[model samples]
Target chain A: TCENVDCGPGKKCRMNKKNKPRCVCAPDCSNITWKGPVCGLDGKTYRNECALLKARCKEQPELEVQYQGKCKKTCRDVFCPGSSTCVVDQTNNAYCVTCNRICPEPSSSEQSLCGNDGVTYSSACHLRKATCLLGRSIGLAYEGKCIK
Target chain B: GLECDGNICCKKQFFVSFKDIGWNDWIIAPSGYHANYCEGECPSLSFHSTVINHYRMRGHSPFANLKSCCVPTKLRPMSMLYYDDGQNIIKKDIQNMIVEECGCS
Candidate 1:
């Protein structure tokens, strides 16, 4: 229910019969031409504006291309090695830190956390990653997996 | 008691209609800065409001602001905090999100 007719990512905005903003995905990035480099809100660099916009569309709705050019060394240039990720906070400031713990890549069996949606995630890492992808703050409901 | 959409999607409060929902029956306080609009009593439907922020990768809380009636699943489309476009996030969008639901339906 977002108000504006913004084709954030993965889609383009179109005007419908009711004059409401409708979204439709583009076929591919073949039609887009590029010129300069850019930095994305998700902390990635692209070859040009078109490339950035095209790539932005493929990701979640939350991320946007903040501005032109790559982050110049300051804000943890790249992913922080292992399970750590580059994150930005309320101040629009970017940094690199793990979400308190090391997230197992495949996750160890048996241990689990229940999310607010009543579903079980493999670990805190799994939950956070899902939250980031979904753009909904589904928090941990409880310690162990959801009870029947 | 009052319902629209559903529990999760409903406006949580029945009064405090400020999203152009009508019922323009508000009372001004002595200071004039405070206004009380309700067909019922205060603190009857008081609750906090939330905002949805799509910016962060963390699924904790969105930038919340106030709303009429009760807590909304999201803010009105015209909200300054909620981005209709690629706007900036403000302090009120984050800190002052709670409206404290008041009055009755």
Candidate 2:
């Protein structure tokens, strides 16, 4: 029976010409309303999970859900993976990149910057490096020493 | 006869070197790390097989021949540092990059 048949994603169980249950591509997904957009591994946005699955069945079988929401067009729209941060270019092109953990020796004229943790860093580069090494998001609180 | 030792479905050592993959120009930390993979035999009688797989094994449907595969059952995240398209240094944690457990599915 089609009820007991387990057709993976993008497929449905139906009666075949041989009067046997078979897995086939889902038909008529246009009626499915858009709950929310999803990003596919192919970098395309689908109206919803149903649309992505239907497209996956007809086109790329290897396609999988990349993430929730539409395809990323800027740093704000994308999630960077593995200790990486997103950055945008002058043309608004977004990219996920790594940070420099190694900080150079402090200069004689190095300015001070206060971190959100209330720790005062010798310079902005030092604070950023600390954040990278700590593997935490610590923004600069201010440009000068942190007051009690 | 099949060598169906359930223990064979275990985690195996695997490393991904960004430099080897021509990604060293952007990736700037650790050079490479162990990201392990899962592979091996999934015995039909093993309890590791999912209920759906067991049903398929005993069914007469078109997918009756489907077999469970040894795959990652658990994963962990890894930290990465690299350069972005804008030449900015960024740090982020990539989830599910490391396989921590393996099972038949």
Candidate 3:
């Protein structure tokens, strides 16, 4: 940052609830921006909704998102199409789950990307890491996506 | 004539040495004529040296007459050298620096 609320490339100044100045993502800031329908991510993780949508986008130019058996337009606005996993036990209830909840391994080998464009970002799995420390990224940087 | 007459007066000069101790811290002889110069045991004032340059030999005190007359241009100067403790580890030995006096006879 240079001066009064001035940030550099890929950085933005946003006012929080308190109206205090803060730096946020310049691109992807919405919760549903890259999110997708809930899918099973192993035992606990509902795969990242954004990652799932991105996978569907890679398969085709567009992806259909069904939430609770209905098309949710805001789904794409959140996770990637096929990235998230459903937390349903036997009843098949689908909902968005955080990465920490599902990926208990925290060190899975595979990784996902932003969008279906296949832009891969490393997770703790690929590197066997736990804490990205809120600021650092182990994954590829998506054009408009930031972790926080 | 000057050499003969000079020898007839003072022959040697006594210097205050490391071995020469002063009485009651006073090193001058009780001549009452005392010291004309503060060399010798009164080192703090001058040097630890005594040049009996003009001896009162044979009772013909040319030194007294010379002293009463005027200050000698060049009296035989006695230098009592001392040590210099610059670094204290090394001392420069006492030595003489000679000056050649050329005066018209």
Candidate 4:
């Protein structure tokens, strides 16, 4: 038997009248079974390395794999209210600061404003800032203890 | 990928949201941050020609793989997509889509 050339998994070899074999994109990629996360330069994630190449073969030959691992965490912005600061670590872990209230008078007055969380804040300003930072409904429970 | 120095962008919705209010600006660290959003101008809407060139956008645009690719998250993930089949049609989805691409945490 004469030697034959193999086209390989992603490409199909075609011969013109000149008898030169050229690699062309494969039409169907149903046979590809490798599984892993691969990020594409096209800003996409493929099931595996083969799938990424297959997608390139199926669509355009220029498509490339960006990285082997999961796609880089796209940008996620953090929000910090008032004087608080928002910080995020490399692992996408986020930490925020507590809101600082611009209370008009000294908290020594004890103008009791009971928060929904049952803690009596020095004033509504304190309660408001606490609720704002917690991102929850922590309104004034009453002018006294939250027992009411 | 324009240089987000000063003109249009804000990069993050968090800052933009505060700006939308009345705050001037805040300091985090490292004075100048690299990434930003083209707020007021770029991340803006026209409702004039929201036409996306689907032909050239093989997979570059986020809407490219949106072939039913939206999965719900625990915190609602800001709802970047909308329902508009046998119902109503509006420009509501536009904001969230751009904001999502801006990448909110």
Q: How high is the TM-score of chain A in model 1?
A: 0.32
Better of 1 and 3 by lDDT: 1
Model 4 lDDT at residue A83: 58
Candidates sorted on DockQ, descending:
2, 4, 1, 3
What C-alpha lDDT values do all the predictions have?
0.41, 0.61, 0.28, 0.40
What DockQ does candidate 1 score?
0.03
Model 1 agreement with the true structure over B1-105: per-residue lDDT tens digits: 213333322323232322232211111000011112223222322242112323223454553432334332222111111111111112111222322222222
Model with the higher TM-score, candidate 3 or 4: 4
All candidates: TM-score = 0.22, 0.35, 0.15, 0.24
lDDT of 3 by residue, B1-105 (tens): 011122122112222332233221111111111112211111011132123333434475554322222111222221111111110011111122111111111
Q: What tens-digit string does per-residue lDDT give for candidate 3 at A1-148? A: 2248765444577778886887653533247653433532211222455544454322211223333223222233333235432222112323332223223332443443332223333432222112111211223334332344
**What would the per-residue lDDT of candidate 2 be over residues A7-122, giving only the tens digit for each residue?**
55556888989899987788455664446887665456788878788765655434455556776766566875566665433334344446555555666534777777889888
TM-score of chain A of 4: 0.30
DockQ of each two-chain model: 0.03, 0.07, 0.00, 0.05
Error of 3 at A147 (Å): 51
| Residue-level lDDT tens digits of model 1 in A61-146 | 22344545564344445434355344443344443333323345654546687877888877655665554334324556776788
Please give the TM-score of chain B in predicted model 1: 0.16
Which sections of candidate 2 miss by over 4 Å?
A: A1-148, B1-7, B44-64
